[PDB]
């Protein structure tokens, strides 16, 4: 009775009834995994249509599961389904290989990928207002000189471009204004023009007071607005002041010089200190609060790895700082004003030139997300020991990596990379990757221990 049930059956079993390989087991595994992805909707379909379960399965044209049935994308196993459903038994992998594919924590973690238009380059990407229906990702453009904002869906994943300005938008911001419940999105490009767009009202396009020099980074932490000019002048706005044309610079924190561009404006993680804000201008770092004045002005100057322009400053119990094309991150103290420790990327990535730290997204209390200059992402358990897992081979160069709360499954990482003919892909990881890479690791060792324990009882 080795012919098996007709619904769950390999084509080499049905068509002609040739001698059964070991790959028919892999084919039935692929069908079972197709049911797992589709909650067995095909099974209960074939219960009413047996010719659909058996005779329609005579070809490997099993449809797009997300199209036919409502389910999460889960795409790294959709490629696996495409692989182990090949009509050639020689093209289907062995079961040890499909077990090693299923052993990847990236497989269980990654939610979806998405490819973009042919050679569009995005420098700034921001999330929407975190509303359940209003779940999308804005994108600027750097592939051309003329800057263009691109609204990009996530539930349907539809690219929608729109011309913005003559220069590429280096940096973008947005704020869900609770006044009148308006989703205000402000676009200050490299040319200094501070345009806005209501996400709901695409006709709501106004310009504010023009930023003098090159706009470098904005921020939206009452509730103010934070903009980092090339002269460092932090023009403080308010969520109701940007609604009109030409809001007033309620503070000018003209900290650095025009040769020192403000590259980041972060925010704290505690409460009783009442969340002193931060920032990095040129190389020297600084702070401010609701007063908007320099609280601390900690000095932070190989040579180009120690002394360069800053990239970002993240606020925690310590301060982690990257520079332009520097493979080390500089752990600084907010109190001691000293280099507490160093973490060089090449001390980890060489254990598997290009690759320097680009983005630094920070998990709440366990992980630290590092974006390499090459197609790698490094996850640091910031407290005890650094390296957990270097994920790679999914992009060419991480451009901007920032977390968000979108699509009702909040705390997802919008890791954005390229694929050089440069396809700029966007991956949506779960933020629970640092727990998954060790949970699966301990669970696999547990099952291996049980297997080796009860294998010895076979010969006993």
From Swiss-Prot:
In UniProt terms, what is the effect of altering residue 351 to R? Decreases WD domain homodimerization. No effect on kinase activity
Q: Where does GTP bind?
A: 68-91, 257-260
First and last residues of every WD repeat: 109-153, 158-198, 203-238, 243-289, 295-333, 353-381, 386-430
Q: What's the impact of mutating residue 382 to I?
A: In PARK8; shows decreased WD domain homodimerization; no effect on kinase activity
Hey, what tissues is this thing expressed in? Expressed in pyramidal neurons in all cortical laminae of the visual cortex, in neurons of the substantia nigra pars compacta and caudate putamen (at protein level). Expressed in neutrophils (at protein level). Expressed in the brain. Expressed throughout the adult brain, but at a lower level than in heart and liver. Also expressed in placenta, lung, skeletal muscle, kidney and pancreas. In the brain, expressed in the cerebellum, cerebral cortex, medulla, spinal cord occipital pole, frontal lobe, temporal lobe and putamen. Expression is particularly high in brain dopaminoceptive areas.
| Localisation | Cytoplasmic vesicle; Perikaryon; Golgi apparatus membrane; Cell projection, Axon
Q: How is it modified after translation?
A: Ubiquitinated by TRIM1; undergoes 'Lys-48'-linked polyubiquitination leading to proteasomal degradation.
Q: What is known of its domains?
A: The seven-bladed WD repeat region is critical for synaptic vesicle trafficking and mediates interaction with multiple vesicle-associated presynaptic proteins. It also mediates homodimerization and regulates kinase activity.
Self-association and partners: Homodimer. Homotetramer; when activated by GTP-bound RAB29. Interacts with PRKN, PRDX3, and TPCN2. Interacts with VPS35. Interacts (via N-terminus) with RAB29; this interaction is direct and stimulates kinase activity. Interacts (via ROC domain) with SEC16A. Interacts with APP; interaction promotes phosphorylation of 'Thr-743' of APP. Interacts with MAPT. Interacts with RAB8A, RAB10, and RAB12. Interacts (via N-terminus) with RAB32.
Tell me its family: Belongs to the protein kinase superfamily. TKL Ser/Thr protein kinase family.
Q: Which disease is it linked to?
A: Parkinson disease 8: A slowly progressive neurodegenerative disorder characterized by bradykinesia, rigidity, resting tremor, postural instability, neuronal loss in the substantia nigra, and the presence of neurofibrillary MAPT (tau)-positive and Lewy bodies in some patients.
Functional description taken from the UniProt entry:
Serine/threonine-protein kinase which phosphorylates a broad range of proteins involved in multiple processes such as neuronal plasticity, innate immunity, autophagy, and vesicle trafficking. Is a key regulator of RAB GTPases by regulating the GTP/GDP exchange and interaction partners of RABs through phosphorylation. Phosphorylates RAB3A, RAB3B, RAB3C, RAB3D, RAB5A, RAB5B, RAB5C, RAB8A, RAB8B, RAB10, RAB12, RAB29, RAB35, and RAB43. Regulates the RAB3IP-catalyzed GDP/GTP exchange for RAB8A through the phosphorylation of 'Thr-72' on RAB8A.
Protein name according to UniProt = Leucine-rich repeat serine/threonine-protein kinase 2
Q: Which organism is it from?
A: Homo sapiens
What's the name of its gene? Answer: LRRK2
């Amino acid at each position: 009775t080795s012919e098996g049930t007709p619904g769950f059956r390999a084509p080499e079993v049905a068509r002609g009834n040739v001698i059964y390989n070991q790959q028919a087991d892999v084919y039935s595994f692929g069908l079972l995994l197709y049911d797992i992805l589709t909650t067995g909707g095909r099974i209960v379909e074939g219960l009413k249509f047996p010719n659909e379960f058996d005779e329609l399965e005579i070809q490997g044209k099993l449809p797009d599961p997300v199209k036919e049935y409502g389910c999460a994308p889960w795409p790294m196993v959709e490629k696996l389904i495409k692989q182990c459903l090949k009509e050639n038994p020689q093209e289907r992998p062995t079961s040890a290989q499909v077990f090693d594919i299923l052993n990847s924590a990236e497989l269980v973690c990654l939610t979806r990928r998405i490819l973009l238009p042919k050679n569009v380059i995005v420098e700034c990407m921001v999330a929407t207002h975190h509303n359940s229906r209003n779940a999308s990702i804005w994108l600027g453009c750097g592939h051309t000189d003329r800057g263009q904002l691109s609204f990009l869906d996530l539930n349907t994943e539809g690219y929608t471009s729109e011309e913005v300005a003559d220069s590429r938008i280096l940096c973008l911001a947005l704020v869900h204004l609770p006044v009148e419940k308006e989703s205000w999105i402000v676009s200050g490009t490299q040319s200094g023009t501070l345009l806005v767009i209501n996400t709901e009202d695409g006709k709501k396009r106004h310009t504010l007071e023009k930023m003098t020099d090159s706009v470098t980074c904005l921020y939206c932490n009452k509730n103010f607005l934070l903009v980092g000019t090339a002269d460092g002048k932090l023009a403080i706005f308010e969520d109701k002041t940007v609604k009109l044309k030409g809001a007033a610079p309620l503070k000018i924190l003209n900290i650095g010089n025009v040769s020192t561009p403000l590259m980041c404006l972060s925010e704290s993680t505690n409460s009783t200190e009442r969340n002193v804000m931060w920032g990095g201008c040129g190389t020297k770092i600084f702070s401010f609060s609701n007063d908007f004045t320099i609280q601390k002005l900690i000095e932070t100057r190989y040579a180009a790895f120690s002394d360069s322009n800053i990239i970002t400053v993240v606020v925690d119990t310590a301060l982690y700082i990257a520079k332009q094309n520097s493979p080390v991150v500089e752990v600084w103290d907010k109190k001691t004003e000293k280099l507490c420790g160093l973490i060089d990327c090449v001390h980890f990535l060489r254990e598997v030139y290009s690759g320097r730290v680009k983005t630094l997204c920070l998990q709440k209390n366990t992980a630290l997300w590092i974006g390499t200059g090459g197609g790698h992402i490094l996850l640091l358990d910031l407290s005890t020991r650094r390296l957990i897992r270097v994920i790679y081979n999914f992009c060419n160069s991480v451009r901007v990596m920032m977390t968000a709360q979108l699509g009702s499954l909040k705390n997802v990482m919008l890791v954005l990379g390229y694929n050089r003919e440069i396809q700029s892909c966007l991956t949506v990881w779960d933020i629970n990757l640092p727990h998954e890479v060790q949970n699966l690791e301990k669970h696999i060792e547990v099952r291996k221990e049980l297997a080796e324990k009860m294998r010895r009882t076979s010969v006993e």
